[PDB]
From Swiss-Prot:
Species name: Arabidopsis thaliana
Residues of the full protein shown: 84 to 208 of 208
First-level EC class: isomerase
Disulfide bonds: 1-13, 102-107
Function of the molecule: PPIases accelerate the folding of proteins. It catalyzes the cis-trans isomerization of proline imidic peptide bonds in oligopeptides. Responsive of the major PPIase activity in the chloroplast thylakoid lumen. Regulates the accumulation of Rieske protein, an essential component of the photosynthetic electron transport chain.
Protein name (record): Peptidyl-prolyl cis-trans isomerase FKBP13, chloroplastic
Gene: FKBP13
Family: Belongs to the FKBP-type PPIase family.
Length: 125
């Protein structure tokens, strides 16, 4: 899985190219995913939550890396319905210096964490 690195640092690898239409801004979509830190620790997954994440893409409902990494951006083609994509997201397009899932200064997602996501774009909701 060698990533294609976009100008922003957002990198991706289409492990399985979708068979359907590309994602469109404002659309409510369904996605299964596994999120891991660079040491391999899984910090969140749709599977653990027992359901897909249905959300509106491209409107700031999720981290910038997801909006850009799924809808596409300079250097990043959009995901297609039914595709599987791995994203490498720099902190600036994720949770930055704040981190996420914090208890005081200790966070499930440490500050300045690069995030790895395996995303399965199932399709529209």
């Amino acid at each position: 899985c060698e990533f294609s690195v976009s100008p922003s640092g957002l990198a991706f690898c289409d492990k399985v190219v979708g068979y359907g239409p590309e994602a469109v801004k404002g659309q409510l979509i369904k996605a299964h995913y596994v999120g891991k830190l660079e040491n391999g620790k899984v910090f969140d997954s749709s599977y653990n939550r027992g359901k897909p994440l249905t959300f509106r893409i491209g409107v700031g409902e999720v981290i910038k890396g997801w909006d850009q990494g799924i809808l596409g951006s300079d250097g990043i083609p959009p995901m297609l319905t039914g595709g599987k994509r791995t994203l490498r997201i720099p902190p600036e397009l994720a949770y930055g210096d704040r981190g996420a899932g914090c208890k005081g200064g200790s966070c499930l997602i440490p500050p300045a964490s690069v995030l790895l996501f395996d995303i399965e774009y199932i399709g529209k909701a």
